[PDB]
From a paper:
In the presence of NADH, acetoin is reduced to 2,3-BDO by the enzyme butanediol dehydrogenase (Bdh). SmBdh exhibits the typical single domain short-chain dehydrogenase/reductase (SDR) architecture. A monomer displays a dinucleotide-binding Rossmann fold that includes seven-stranded parallel β-sheet (β3–β2–β1–β4–β5–β6–β7) flanked by three α-helices (α2, α1, and α8) on one side and three α-helices (α3, α4, and α5) on another. There is an additional small lobe on top of a core structure, formed by two short helices, α6 and α7, creating a deep cleft in which the cofactor is bound, and where the active site is located.
Residue numbers in the entry:
A (entry chain B), C (entry chain B): -1 to 250
B (entry chain A), D (entry chain A): 1 to 251
Write the structure that this text describes.
Amino acid sequence: FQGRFDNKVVVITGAGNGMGEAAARRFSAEGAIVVLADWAKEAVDKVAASLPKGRAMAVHIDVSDHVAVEKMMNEVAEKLGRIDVLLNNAGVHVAGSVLETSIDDWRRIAGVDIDGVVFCSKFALPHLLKTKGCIVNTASVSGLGGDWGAAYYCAAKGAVVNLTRAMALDHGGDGVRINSVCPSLVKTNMTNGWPQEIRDKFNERIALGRAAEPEEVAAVMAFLASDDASFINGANIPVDGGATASDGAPKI
Amino acid sequence: GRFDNKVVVITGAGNGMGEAAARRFSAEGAIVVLADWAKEAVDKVAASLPKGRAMAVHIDVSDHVAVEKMMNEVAEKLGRIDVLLNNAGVHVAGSVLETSIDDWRRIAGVDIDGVVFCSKFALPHLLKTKGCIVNTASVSGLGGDWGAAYYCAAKGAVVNLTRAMALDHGGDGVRINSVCPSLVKTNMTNGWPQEIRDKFNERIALGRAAEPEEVAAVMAFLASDDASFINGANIPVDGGATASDGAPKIV
Amino acid sequence: FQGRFDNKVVVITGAGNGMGEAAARRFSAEGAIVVLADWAKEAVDKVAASLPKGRAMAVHIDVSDHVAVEKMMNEVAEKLGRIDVLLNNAGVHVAGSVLETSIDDWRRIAGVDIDGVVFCSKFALPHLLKTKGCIVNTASVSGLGGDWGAAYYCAAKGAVVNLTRAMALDHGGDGVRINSVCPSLVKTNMTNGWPQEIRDKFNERIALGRAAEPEEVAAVMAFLASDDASFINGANIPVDGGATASDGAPKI
Amino acid sequence: GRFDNKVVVITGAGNGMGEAAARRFSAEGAIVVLADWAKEAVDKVAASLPKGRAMAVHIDVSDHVAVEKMMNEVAEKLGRIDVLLNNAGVHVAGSVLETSIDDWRRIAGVDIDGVVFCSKFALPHLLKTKGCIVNTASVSGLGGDWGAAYYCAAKGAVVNLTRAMALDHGGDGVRINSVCPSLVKTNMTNGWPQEIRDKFNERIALGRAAEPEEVAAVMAFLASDDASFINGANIPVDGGATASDGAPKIV
Ligand SMILES: NC(=O)c1ccc[n+]([C@@H]2O[C@H](COP(=O)([O-])OP(=O)(O)OC[C@H]3O[C@@H](n4cnc5c(N)ncnc54)[C@H](O)[C@@H]3O)[C@@H](O)[C@H]2O)c1
Ligand SMILES: NC(=O)c1ccc[n+]([C@@H]2O[C@H](COP(=O)([O-])OP(=O)(O)OC[C@H]3O[C@@H](n4cnc5c(N)ncnc54)[C@H](O)[C@@H]3O)[C@@H](O)[C@H]2O)c1
Ligand SMILES: NC(=O)c1ccc[n+]([C@@H]2O[C@H](COP(=O)([O-])OP(=O)(O)OC[C@H]3O[C@@H](n4cnc5c(N)ncnc54)[C@H](O)[C@@H]3O)[C@@H](O)[C@H]2O)c1
Ligand SMILES: NC(=O)c1ccc[n+]([C@@H]2O[C@H](COP(=O)([O-])OP(=O)(O)OC[C@H]3O[C@@H](n4cnc5c(N)ncnc54)[C@H](O)[C@@H]3O)[C@@H](O)[C@H]2O)c1
Ligand SMILES: Nc1ncnc2c1ncn2[C@@H]1O[C@H](COP(=O)(O)OP(=O)(O)O)[C@@H](O)[C@H]1O
Ligand SMILES: Nc1ncnc2c1ncn2[C@@H]1O[C@H](COP(=O)(O)OP(=O)(O)O)[C@@H](O)[C@H]1O
Ligand code: NA
Ligand code: NA
Ligand code: NA
Ligand code: NA
């Protein structure tokens, strides 16, 4: 894998979260120039400073802001001369049915989880078309099926999963492949803090019996951006240890 | 009499599948609330149905303030809501590169926000009647199209919102399902060229576009007691469109 | 619904099981001439004798036997002059992973659950084409997704679900619609005998919080055979109270 | 060295995607067992690979007695099995009305029974290595075709067997997944007329048939440590074929 992404420019939104950092490190190890784009400063600055000098840069972005996103994509292309890979990894979650969640909760979910993927993809694509680059969306198993108690989140991830399909049809023939990863439970500080009773309920539904490490999702992002994935287009790859392979029946 | 004295709220009721649903539910005894932003069109449909059993509301379903008011006024005036058909929708053709931010806001406002808001504000009333929701999604929410990116994102949202809300509310006696039509003979597609429409007859195994009555028929079924164990389903009404793996005919 | 299937000939395989009997009664109530086809005699004889005289007949069939199935379909067509509806409702289940289940278990699952649908559909179709009739397959949620501990059964029901699609493409344009119902847990003597701990685990996965009555599955079969389903072709309708609408995550 | 000294059993290894997998796994350090009923073809592939690191088995995978023997002999002789590629397959074109009971038995024997039997008899060995299975399914197992009914039933079985076995064995450290190609340039499709093949370039967004190496690449990925959290997945390698809702292009 040494040199798989040598001198490729990889723009990573939501670069300051577990999967974002793992993606930045994996692509960086394989020779990429990473742009770590996030709202928050501290996390992406710390990651960028850990990576080879001149091969990583941190930016502030609100992915829900189309004017800011267009500017970021054009400045990155101007400064680095190219964009090869977009990882749409920004995310917000809010828990609840539509009865437990507000219009504001909807706007927060929709702005980042839907509008961010639409805007970053639309404004990166002209650059990707020049390099025959690709997009990898961070969707979710929550976009392939429903959850109890995350209605707006499921709507937004459902939008990303089907937008991945539609855009793959629109652009794949012009040499830009568009795919998603659909993770389940990812080991984070939030999941490390869960009681055993909660964590055991999740592990029972996943045949592999554990949460994904963020490196395990990053690995699939790197594969989907690689020449080995040359015939994978419009795919929403479950990275879920078997979660969505079930018909919903309990394990007996 | 399948829907005798059931209150049925139908968005996009002034034309096409909404109008066809209004007539079908009305014929089966429903009191029908016809919601549309096309005022002349929805007034004409309302006036065509039996007196005292149909009322028109001039509303943009993208507007949460207008939607909350409609749902509460309907519930107050008629005493109940039994069925919501989230049918109002608009289409725009093109990739994200050929369609504007404004095109996105129009698609998202009607096709996603409308469904979210109407569902949210009807649900407290549906819980009292053990009522149901039927969303008009599309095959374009079960898979992608060439040249309708924003529309596909919006319909994808409707398909998975259908699933999530069914898990949330099915246990409290409110079933939530969708219909997913392919080509239907309506104002939405009557501008589409013969080249495109003829290819649908190749991609749809039944070899024709659907009549709007044929989707209305499935909406009525999904709201009926015969659908008592169907929940969170996105029912293709597509003559076989989504049954295909995408391959052209092998022979 | 009085007269919806007036004088239509409805051939029901596996007519002696819960869903079969419920289908026979529902179609019979709506005016159909029912042929109740099953291996076993007592159950279908009792149902046929309960239904209007001259409007129900019981037959013995092994649906896994192509020679016997061709003969049954041609004799029914000759005797009644027509076939309008085929309900492929025969089934066997065997529990276990491929490590816990034998070659014989595979042959038993495959013969009835796959070969029966292939053979009955192939030999009924010439008759269905004359009436512009339809097929409704009894598939399962176990054909739309996997189970723990029913590997062969899941393979066979997966075959029925995709054969439903393929045959719908082949025949829908010649006026024979082909669809399936995909039930979850159906209330039977087997499920009535389950301990509360087992039944509670099933009910938790189903948003409606209960097993389907066989009448509730029969209702969907009758709909799929009706003129109201004129544009439904190649569909595998979940009749599962929400079971397959889940992404597999536990309810919290 | 990704597969250094891993034993990889490949059915249908004498041609097409099987042969391409044998060469790819061999280049990455695997010892490759090439199983095929085409004896000259699989012997030529085996003889092309590094001495001591490839062996041919002349076997009909539809035969459970032959398959159990192969799996146990391979395990005894090489001490282990790390990867099974259930790739052997045959195609027949036609509806059930145009294809015979014998056509069915041939399709089912190879395309279903072969996968069931090879999986069943390799699994005890894979459990010892925390190995994996990659099934060659098809888009024709994720949806239907016009004119390949028996093939679609068989591939549908492979797709859902992949899911069920992943739930059964994933917890014991054996991942089970499939690749689902659309049109690939192999002996299976080289007889298909230009009319049909040209329409695939329309239905596949990438606008071409796959090279067999492009599916072999995904087989190697699914057997690799990078796929450590992918289990029960049916991965489309189809240039977009199944991403479509079936509709022809909208513009
Ligand atoms: N016609 C097709 O081929 C097809 C296929 C799949 C799904 N659909 C869906 O069917 C639904 C109905 O559309 P149709 O085909 O019957 O078209 P139509 O144009 O006949 O009817 C749509 C109706 O919705 C109304 N409407 C639009 N936006 C609205 C808003 N913001 N507030 C209130 N009313 C609004 C329109 O005025 C119109 O009366 C839509 O959701 C559409 O996406 C259409
Ligand atoms: N902000 C809003 O309130 C808003 C926004 C958009 C449109 N609308 C309403 O939508 C309605 C339609 O106006 P429009 O500007 O969209 O026109 P339009 O673009 O819909 O033109 C007429 C449409 O209906 C079809 N049509 C034409 N003659 C018809 C007939 N006799 N019967 C049925 N269908 C016919 C046409 O093919 C076309 O689809 C108006 O009532 C308008 O006020 C509301
Ligand atoms: N080529 C395509 O377009 C395509 C698309 C989707 C999936 N597939 C699947 O790919 C797999 C490989 O086929 P291919 O396209 O590389 O074709 P191929 O003809 O190049 O190779 C298939 C190989 O399987 C062998 N084989 C067949 N039946 C066998 C049996 N009973 N026992 C042992 N070996 C047997 C053949 O001799 C041949 O060497 C099959 O499962 C096929 O269904 C093919
Ligand atoms: N019962 C069995 O053991 C059984 C059953 C069927 C076939 N087979 C074996 O399958 C093999 C193929 O024989 P067949 O009768 O299927 O022939 P065939 O029908 O496969 O004819 C040759 C096939 O390979 C292709 N081909 C032709 N020349 C080629 C070349 N130089 N390189 C690569 N591919 C080429 C052709 O396009 C065609 O697909 C034989 O070894 C046969 O014994 C085994
Ligand atoms: N509007 C936004 N613009 C850019 N990045 C954002 C925006 N909203 C959230 N992000 C970033 O996306 C990443 C993923 O968010 P989230 O999933 O909430 O984080 P976590 O995985 O830490 O819970 C975070 O690093 C977050 O700061
Ligand atoms: N080979 C066969 N030919 C015809 N009918 C069969 C065959 N095998 C089983 N059946 C019938 O199919 C029906 C469904 O079988 P099964 O699901 O095992 O029954 P149950 O629902 O009572 O458990 C039964 O009435 C059974 O007798
Ligand atoms: Na995960
Ligand atoms: Na129009
Ligand atoms: Na059920
Ligand atoms: Na050939």
